[PDB]
């Protein structure tokens, strides 16, 4: 019906500023250290 010259345009529904736009194509119209290895009792203990 609406198809024009081999083009299948059929599958279409047919029934501030106020600009006007064209329809169908819109455009303007833990762990804490332990004592060892912490450097005491490694220089100490006079007993």
């Amino acid at each position: 019906x609406x198809x024009x010259x081999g083009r299948x345009x059929x599958x279409x529904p047919x029934x501030x500023x106020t600009x006007x736009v064209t329809x169908l194509x819109x455009x303007x119209x833990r762990x804490y250290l332990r004592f060892h290895x912490x450097x005491y009792x490694x220089x100490x203990x006079x007993x």
């Binding site: 501030x16 500023x17 106020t18 736009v21 064209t22 329809x23 169908l24 819109x26 455009x27 119209x29």
Partner: protein
């Protein structure tokens, strides 16, 4: 003859126009205007 729409724009956006590039766009989106890249053309 063509069907009409009606849309709304904030008043501070009247500068926007199709077919035209504004300086606000050029200084907001600088990538498309440095003339080094062939894909990103205005």
């Amino acid at each position: 003859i063509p069907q009409a729409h009606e849309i709304v724009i904030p008043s501070y956006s009247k500068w926007f126009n199709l077919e035209k590039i504004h300086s606000i766009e050029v200084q907001s989106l600088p990538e498309f205007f440095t003339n080094r890249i062939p894909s990103k053309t205005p």
